[PDB]
Amino acid sequence: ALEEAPWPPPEGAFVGFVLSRKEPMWADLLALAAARGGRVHRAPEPYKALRDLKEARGLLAKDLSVLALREGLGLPPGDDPMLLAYLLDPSNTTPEGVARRYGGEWTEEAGERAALSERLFANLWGRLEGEERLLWLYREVERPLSAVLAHMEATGVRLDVAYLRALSLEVAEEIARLEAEVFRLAGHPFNLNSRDQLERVLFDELGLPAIGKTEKTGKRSTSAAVLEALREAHPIVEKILQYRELTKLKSTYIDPLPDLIHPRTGRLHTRFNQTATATGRLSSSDPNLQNIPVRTPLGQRIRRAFIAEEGWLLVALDYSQIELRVLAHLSGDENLIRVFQEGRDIHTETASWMDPLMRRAAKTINFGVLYGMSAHRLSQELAIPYEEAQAFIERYFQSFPKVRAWIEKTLEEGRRRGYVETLFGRRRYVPDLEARVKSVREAAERKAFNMPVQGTAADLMKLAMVKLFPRLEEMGARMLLQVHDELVLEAPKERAEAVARLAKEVMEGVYPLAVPLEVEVGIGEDWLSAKE
DNA sequence: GACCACGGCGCG
DNA sequence: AAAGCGCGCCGTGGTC
Ligand SMILES: O=c1[nH]c2ccccc2n1[C@H]1C[C@H](O)[C@@H](COP(=O)(O)OP(=O)(O)OP(=O)(O)O)O1
Ligand SMILES: [Mg+2]
Ligand SMILES: [Mg+2]
Ligand SMILES: [Mn+2]
Ligand SMILES: [Mn+2]
Numbered sequence: 001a002l003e004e005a006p007w008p009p010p011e012g013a014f015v016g017f018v019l020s021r022k023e024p025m026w027a028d029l030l031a032l033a034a035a036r037g038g039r040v041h042r043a044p045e046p047y048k049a050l051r052d053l054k055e056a057r058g059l060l061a062k063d064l065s066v067l068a069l070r071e072g073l074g075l076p077p078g079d080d081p082m083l084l085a086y087l088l089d090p091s092n093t094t095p096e097g098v099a100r101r102y103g104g105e106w107t108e109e110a111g112e113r114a115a116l117s118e119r120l121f122a123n124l125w126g127r128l129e130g131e132e133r134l135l136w137l138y139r140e141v142e143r144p145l146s147a148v149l150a151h152m153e154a155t156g157v158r159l160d161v162a163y164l165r166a167l168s169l170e171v172a173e174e175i176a177r178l179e180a181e182v183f184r185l186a187g188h189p190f191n192l193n194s195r196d197q198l199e200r201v202l203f204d205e206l207g208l209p210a211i212g213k214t215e216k217t218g219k220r221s222t223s224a225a226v227l228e229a230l231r232e233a234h235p236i237v238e239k240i241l242q243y244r245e246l247t248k249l250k251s252t253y254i255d256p257l258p259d260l261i262h263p264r265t266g267r268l269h270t271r272f273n274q275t276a277t278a279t280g281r282l283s284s285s286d287p288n289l290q291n292i293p294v295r296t297p298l299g300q301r302i303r304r305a306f307i308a309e310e311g312w313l314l315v316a317l318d319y320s321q322i323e324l325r326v327l328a329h330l331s332g333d334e335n336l337i338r339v340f341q342e343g344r345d346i347h348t349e350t351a352s353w354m355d356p357l358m359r360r361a362a363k364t365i366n367f368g369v370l371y372g373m374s375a376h377r378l379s380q381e382l383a384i385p386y387e388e389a390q391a392f393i394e395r396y397f398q399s400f401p402k403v404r405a406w407i408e409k410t411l412e413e414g415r416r417r418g419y420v421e422t423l424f425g426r427r428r429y430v431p432d433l434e435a436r437v438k439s440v441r442e443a444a445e446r447k448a449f450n451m452p453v454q455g456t457a458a459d460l461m462k463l464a465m466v467k468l469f470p471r472l473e474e475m476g477a478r479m480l481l482q483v484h485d486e487l488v489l490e491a492p493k494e495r496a497e498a499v500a501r502l503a504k505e506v507m508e509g510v511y512p513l514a515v516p517l518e519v520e521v522g523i524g525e526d527w528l529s530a531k532e
Numbered sequence: 533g534a535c536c537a538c539g540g541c542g543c544g
Numbered sequence: 545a546a547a548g549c550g551c552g553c554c555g556t557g558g559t560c
Contacts, residue, residue: 193555195539212545214539221545223540229545248541252554279550281544288552291543299542322544323549363544364548371548380546442547450549454544458550484544484550 002040002115008052009034009041014121015058016113017046023286024066025153025262025269033110035118040111050075058117059095059106062146062153062274069154070264077146081117084124086275087134087142090428093275102127133425141424141462142274148469148479149272149282156267157289157480157488160305160526161258167301171250178243185236192243198222208234229380249293253302260287272482278447280426280455280462281484290483292527295360306488306527313496313523314480315489316530317503319461320518321347322485323367326456329513330423333402340515354382354392369396370403372446410449420448422455457485460517464510468503475499488527496523 013036019027032046034053043049053075056065061077068075085092085102092098095116099106102123104116128134183189186205190197199220203210210220211229224244230237262269268287276283284290292306293299308314319325324346328336339346350362369378369392379389397404414420415434419427428451432444465482472479477491477499487507491499504521524530 191556195556197556214545216538219539221539223545225545244541248554252542256553273551276552277550281550283551285552288543291541291552293542295543367544368548373548374546377546377548439547446548447550454550457544486544 002035002038002111005039005041007034007041007043007049010036011054012036012057013041013053014114014117015053015056015061015064016110016115016117017064018108018110018113019063019067023269023271024063025070025156027067029067031110033114035111035114040115042111046110047071057121059098059113059120062150065147065150066153066271069150077143077150079121079143080146081120081124082275083138083142083146084121084128087137087426088124088127088131090275090278090280090426134427137424137426137459141459141466144466145462146274148465149274151469152479152481153269153271155478155480155490156262156265156269157490158266158307158309159257159261159268160307161261164254164258164302164305167305168250168254171246171254171298175243175246175250178239178246181239182236182243185239192240193247195219195222198240202230202237206234206236208237225380245296245298249298249302253293257287257305270481278428279451280422280458282458282462282482284481284483289481294528295357300528303528304526308490308525311493312490313493313525314527314530315477315491315496315500315503315521315523316486316527317489317500317507317519317521318486318531319457319507320520321345322457322460322517323453324370325513325515325517326423326453326460327370327403327406328515330452330456331400331402331406332514333400333406336400336403337515366396369393371450372442407449410452411445414448420451422452422459424456424459426455426459428455460510461485464507467510468506471502471506472499475502488530491523 013034016033018030020030021027029046032043032049034041050068050071050073055078056075057078059081061080065075065077082095082098085098095106099116099120102120104120106116107113179192182192186201190201192198199222202208202222203220208230211226212221213219214221224241227237227241257268260268270284270289271286273283273285293302325340328340347359347362347366350366351358354362354365375386375390375393378392379386382389410420411433414430418431419429421427430444430448432440433448435441435444469479472489475495477489477495479487480490481488489499489503500521500523504519507519508517522530522532
C-alpha cells in the first residue's frame, strides 16, 4: 500500500520507468518512479528527475542507464532482479515472467514498476541466499557487466553509410539479373521470395526430387541444404542459391543498417541483452550486430562498412578455438590438453583432412561433429559417403577419449540434479533428460552437455569484459562490440598498439585454465581490416 | 497499424 | 532436410 512521497526519493531507492519503445537509445522517457521504505516517489518531469538518481537499481536497470548516458548523465546500473532471476534459472528472460513467478505483475506505470522492483529484489535475493556460486557470478560478473554493456550500447559504432547506399544500388542490379533468369527458366514469373510458390515450381512444375520436409507443417523444403543437393540436378537451383544470398544480405543488412544511425551520435547502436539466452551468452538486437556477414565475399563488403571514428582505429580480439580449449579443461583429456599445450591447431587440421574459407568449413565440421551431429549430415556436408562420415566421427573422438567420459558424467549429473552447470556454476535446467520419447530425450542431452561448454566460454568472456573495461577507459579507449568470443574496441590512433597488447593480455589471463587461452588481435580502419 | 508462426539464414 | 548447440531478423502468409 505504498504512499506517495515527494520526489526526490531517498538514496538507494528502487526505480521504475516507462519507455515509448524498447530501444533505450531511441526511446522517449514517459515516466520515472522510485520506491523505498514503504513509499513510492513519482517524478513530475521524468527527464529532469533523472538527474536526482545516483544509480539505476531495479528491473531493466541497464536500459535506463543507457538512456541516461544518451542524455549526458552518468547513472550506472546497480542491482537488477532480472539478473538474480536469470542466474537462478536462465529461462527467466522477461519481466513479465519474472513478476508472475516471484510475486507481482509487470504493468505499464513507473510507480508499480518501482514497487515491483523492490519486492521482487527482496524475494529473489532471498532465493539466492546460500547459492554462493551464483552470488559470486552476480557480484563479480553480471552486475558489473551491466555497466559495461550500458556503455557499449550508448557508445555505438561508426558505419560508412554512403558506401552501403551505393552497395544497395549495385546489389539490386545483380538481384534483378538473377530474378530474370529464374523467371525465364521457370517459364513464368512468381514471387521468388515466397517459399511456398518456389516449392510448387521446383517439385511440381519442374518435377525435381523433394529431398526433405519442413519441421512444423511438412511442406517440401526449399532450404539451402536441399538446394545444394540439387546444384547440378538443374541450372535454376544454382541461381536460386545466389538470389537468396543477395536478397538475404540486401534486406537484412545493406538496406536497414544505414537508416538506423542515431541523429545525436551519428553512430549505430545495438542492444546487448543480458538475460536472453539459456547458456549465459549475450545476445544482440535492434539491430543484431552479432551476425554481421563475413563468410562470403559479399558479406565481407558489408563488414567493411563498420569503421572507426576519424583519428581512431578498430581493435579486433578473438579467442582461438575457445570452446575446444574449454572442453580440454572441463574434461581433462590429456591428449586434448597437449594439443593446446604445444600450440597445435585442429581447425586447420580438419581443413586439409576434409586458407581462410577452408578453415571456416572445418569450424562448422569439428563443431558439428563435436556436439552430436549425425553421420548422415556429416557425410552430406563433406560430400563423402556415409561409410566415410562415420570414420571421421570414430577417429574424432578416439583421439580424445576423456571427452565422451565427460559427456556421460555431465548427463548423469544433470539427470540427478535436474540441471547442468558451467565451470563457475551457472545453471541451466534441462528437464527432458529423463523423457521417455527417445528423440525428445536425446535432444535434451544435446542441449545439456553443450551448455557447460558454451556457457563457460561466455563466463570467461564476460569476466574478460569486466576486467578489461576499466583499463580501456583509463587509456581513453572504447569497447564497442562483443560477438561471443570476440571483442571490437575503438582506440585513438596513437594508443591503438598499446590497447591491443593490453587487451590481448587481459583476455588471455582472464582465468587461467589447464590449457592456455590464446587470442588473435588485429588493428584497422574497419572491422574487416582488423581481422587480418 | 499491430501481432504471430513459419521457413529460412545470418553469426558465434 | 537429417541424431550439432546458441541466438535475432527477414519476407510471407494469416489474423485482428
Ligand atoms: O558452435 C559453433 N559452431 C560454429 C561454426 C562456425 C564457427 C564457430 C562456431 N561455433 C562456436 C564455438 C565457439 O563458442 C565460437 C568460436 O568462434 P570462431 O571465432 O568462429 O571459432 P574458433 O574459436 O573455434 O576459432 P578461430 O577464432 O580461430 O576462428 O563459435
Ligand atoms: Mg556486385
Ligand atoms: Mg523460429
Ligand atoms: Mn570468432
Ligand atoms: Mn575464435
